[PDB]
Amino acid sequence: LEKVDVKTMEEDEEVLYKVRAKLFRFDADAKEWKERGTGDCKFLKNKKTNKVRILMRRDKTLKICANHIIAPEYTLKPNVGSDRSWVYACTADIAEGEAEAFTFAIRFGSKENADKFKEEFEKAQEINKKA
C-alpha cells in the first residue's frame, strides 16, 4: 500500500464553535435511544457560501457521526430526562451515506455547555437564513 494524503474536506471552513458531546439517534422501530458517537461537535462555516453545518466525529476512529446543515427551521427541545441535552429533528444527515432524516439528541458535560450550544445553534440558524 502507498501513503494516501486524501483529506478531511473541512479545509475551506471556519470553526465557529466546538464542544465535547454525546450524540444519540431515536430508533422508532424499537422504542429507544441509541448512541451514535462521542467526540467534538463543531459548527463549520463554509468560507465561500457562508453556510453553517454541524460536523461531529468520534474519538479515536474519527468517523463521522453527524454531518448536516443547521437549517433555520430546526428547533432545539429539552428531553424529559436531562437538564443538559437537546433534541431536534434533522431532515438530511449524511454521516452514514445518502441523506436521511433523524431525531437526534445531543448531551453535554453540563447544563452550561448545553446552554452555549443552543445560543450558537441559533446564531448559526441566523447565519444560514440571512445567506
Partner: protein
Amino acid sequence: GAMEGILDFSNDLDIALLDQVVSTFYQGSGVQQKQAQEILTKFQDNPDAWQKADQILQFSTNPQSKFIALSILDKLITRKWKLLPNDHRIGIRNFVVGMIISMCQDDEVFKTQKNLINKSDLTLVQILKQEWPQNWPEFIPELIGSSSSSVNVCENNMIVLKLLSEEVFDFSAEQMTQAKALHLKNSMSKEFEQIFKLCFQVLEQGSSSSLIVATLESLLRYLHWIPYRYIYETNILELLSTKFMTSPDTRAITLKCLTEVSNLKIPQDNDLIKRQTVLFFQNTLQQIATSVMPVTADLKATYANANGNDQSFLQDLAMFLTTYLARNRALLESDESLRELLLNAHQYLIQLSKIEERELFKTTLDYWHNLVADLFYEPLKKHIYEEICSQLRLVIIENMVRPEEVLVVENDEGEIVREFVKESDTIQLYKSEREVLVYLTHLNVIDTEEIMISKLARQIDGSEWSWHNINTLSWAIGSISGTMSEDTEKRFVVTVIKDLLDLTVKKRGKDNKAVVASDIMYVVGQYPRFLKAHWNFLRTVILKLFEFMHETHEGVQDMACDTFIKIVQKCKYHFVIQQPRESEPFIQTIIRDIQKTTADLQPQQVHTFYKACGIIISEERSVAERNRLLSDLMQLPNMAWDTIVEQSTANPTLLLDSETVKIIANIIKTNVAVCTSMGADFYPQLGHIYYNMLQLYRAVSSMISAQVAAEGLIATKTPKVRGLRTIKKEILKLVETYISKARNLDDVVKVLVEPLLNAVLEDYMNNVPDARDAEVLNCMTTVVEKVGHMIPQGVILILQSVFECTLDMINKDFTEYPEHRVEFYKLLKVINEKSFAAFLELPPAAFKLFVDAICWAFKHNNRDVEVNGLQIALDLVKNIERMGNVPFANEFHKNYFFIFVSETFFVLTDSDHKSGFSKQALLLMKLISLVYDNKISVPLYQEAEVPQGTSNQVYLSQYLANMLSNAFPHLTSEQIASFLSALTKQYKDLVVFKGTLRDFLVQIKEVGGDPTDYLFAEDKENA
C-alpha cells in the same frame, strides 16, 4: 429455494449443490451468504449427515465441503462412536486413513490443501482416542514404517503425532474421564522410545525444511511430558542449539523448544546435566550473535520497523532469555569463564527492554524484578551485575508510566486535559516499575541520585525540556521515596522542589502550568517523611496546594485536593499541634479560611477538602478539643442545614426547587465525606442533625411517591425526582458509613437504629418497585452485620418489610433490578449468618419462599448472586444441622433436603453454570454427608413408600438413580449406579469427589461411557 435441497435426506445428496451452498457461504455475502450459513448448520446438525461424509470426501470438488464433512464425522466420533456397529467403525477408519494417504501422494494437493490435511489428521486422532491401542495395536509401528515410504507421509506423520500428544497430554483434563486420560497417557508413554528414535533420526538426517519444521513442532509438545533422559542423554540439545538456530525456518520453533527445556527444574547434584544446560545456552547465544544480530544492535528500531518475523523473534528471544535466566543464572555466576556469556545474555535483555511495546516491556520487567530482588537478598551477587544495573536504572527512569494519582494527560491534539478513565493496566505497570526502581536504588543509591539530578539539570536549563521528559523524571523521583537516608533525602528533595518551583516560573501557558503542577504535587505527596521534619516546607507546600485549588484547570484542582488528603494522612500530627513561631494549630487556620480556599472548587472537590480536614481532626485525641474542631469544621454546612430545614419544613414544595435539592444533597455529601474520615469520632455531628435528617428522609419520600403517582413511573427518570432520590441515597450512605465504623454499639442500638428502621422500612415496602432504593438493603446489611446480634426483633422487622416484596421484583427473570438482586442476597446472607433465628419466626409459606429464593440465586450467571446463593445454602444447611434432633430441623429435612440435592445437581450438570462448579460440589458433599454420617434423625421418605426401616442411605441412592435416569435417559443404569457408588464413598475428599463429578460431566455428553471409569480413585488408593 434450491439451496435447501441438501436438507432432504430421503433423496440422494447432490454433491454439486452442496458445493455451491458451501461456496455461497464462504465466498458470497449479505442475505445469500446468511441463508447458506443457516442451511449448512442444519445439514451439519442432522443426526444422519455423517452417512454422507464418505460420499462428500470422494466426490466433492470443494475443500471446504470436505472440511465440514470431517467436522460432521468428528462429532460422531466424539459423541456416538460406541453406539456404532463395528461395520461403520472400521469403514470410517479405512476411508479417513485412505484419504490421508491420497493427499500425501498428490504433491500439489499436499502443498495446497494444508487446512484439509490438518483437519483430516485431527479426525484420525479422534478415532485414536476411541480405538488405540486396544483396537489398533499396530498404529505406531506402522506409522513409523510408512514414514520411509514418502517424504510427504513422514512430514504428515509428524503432524499426527503432534496432535496426538496435544489431545492426550495438553487438553485431556476436562474432556476425557480420568481413567481414559490415564489409559492414553500410559499408552503413549509405552511407545515413545520408537517415536523419539524416528523424530531424532529425521532431525539428524532430514532434509526438507518443511519436514524438519513439522518434526520440531511435534518435539515442542513432547517436551511438555517426556522423561528428562530423552533431552539430556541424547545429542538433541546440541542439535537444537546449533544447527536449528542457524536456519531461519527452524529458528522460531527451536527457541520455543529450548524455552521449554530452560524452565525445567534440574537435579542439582548432577554436574553433567548442569554442564549440558550451560552448553545449550552458550551455543544458542553464539548463534544469535553470529546469525541474527550482535549484542549492540538497536532492537528498539528493529522491532518498530517490523520487517518479516522480527517482532515474533524478539518476543521469543525475550521469553527464552528470561525463562532460562530466572531458572539457571546461578550456573553462570561463579565460573569466571562464563561471566561473559552471563553478561551478554543480560545485555540482550537490556536492549530488548528499550523496545516500545508494553506487553514485551512487562515480560522483561517481570524478569528484572526477579533479578534485582535476588541482588537485594542474596550475598555476593550484586557486584557481578553492577554495569547491567546501571543501564537498567536509565531504561526504567526513562520509561516510567503515569501513576494513578496524576490526573492530567495529553489528548490527541496536544492539549493537557483531565483524565476521563482510570487505566488499570498502566497503574499496574507503574507499580511494577516502582518496585524494580526501588530495589535498584537500594543497590546503588549514589548512582540513582546522580542520574536523576543530572536529568533534572537538563530540564531546568531547557536543553532536554519536554512534557514527556519532565513527567517521567518526576514520576521516577516520586517512586523511590523511602530508599535514601533521611540526610540524603533532605538534600535531594530540597533541590528537586526548588527546581520544579522555578520551572513553574519559566513555562507559561495553561498546558505547561498543568504539567508542572501535576509533577510538583506528585513529588511532594510522595515525601511525607521530609515534610514532617520540615514544618516551614510542609506549610509552604499546603499553601501552594491551596493556590492550585484556584487554578482554572479542573485536573489541577482535582489533584490538589487528592494530594492534600494524601499529605494529611501521613502528616496530620503537624497540623494539630501548635508549631514554634505560630500562634495556633494550622488546622484552626485551615478551617477558618475554608470558604475562601474552596470558592473555586466544584462540590465534589469541596467534599474532598472537608474529608481531608476530617483526617486532621481525628488525630486530636482529647474528646473536648476534637469535638470543638468538628463543630468549627461543620459550621458552614450546619448553618446551611438549619435554614434549609426551617424553610423546607415551612414549605414542602421547595423540595421541588432544583436549587434547594442541590443545596441539601451537598450538605449531606459533606457530612458523608467527614464521617468517612472521622468514623466513630463523627458521632456528635451525626447527633446534631439526626432527627431533622430522618424527618427530611420522610418528606422527600412522600414527594417522590406523589410525583410518581402524578407523572408516572417515567418521573423516576426526571432531574427533579433523581435529585430527590440522591438526597435519600446520601442519607442512607451517611448512616451506613457511621454504623460501619462505630465503636459505641450501644448508642447505635439505643439511639440510631429504631428511628432509622421506622423512617426507612415501611417507606421501602410501600413504594412501587421502580421507586424502591436498593441502597436501603445495603444500609440494612451494614446494620445487621454490625449490630444484628443485638437487635433480633429489628432483624425480624427488616425481613418483614423487604423480603417478599424484593423477591417479587427479582424472581420473574435474571435481568431486571440488578442492584436490588445483588443487595438482596447480601442482606439474606448476613441475616442467615448473624441472626438465623429471624428465619425461624417466618410463617411456613414465607420460609418456603426463602428456600425458593436460595435456589433461584443459584440459577443466576451473575457471579455475585450465584456465589452468595451457594454460600447461603451451605450456611443454612449448617444452621439446621446445628439445631437439635428437633422438630424444626426434622421438618426442614423432610421438606427441603431433596429440593437442595436436585437443585444442586441441576446447576452442576447443565451447561450454563460452570463457574460455580467448586461450591456446587462442596454443597453436594455436605448434603451427602448429612445422610452418610447419620446426621438426619428422621426418615426422609414417606410412610409406605419403601420397606420396613430402610436407611436414608439406600433411599438417597434410589432417589438419585431415579432422578438421574429421567434427567439423562441415554445413560445406562449401570453407569448411574457406579457413579453414585463412587460419590457416596468420596464425600470427605474434595479433590477426588470433584474428579468424579467431572467424569460424570464427560460421560453425560456422550453415549456408552465406561461405568468402570468411576473406580479411578479406588486404584490410587490401591497404588
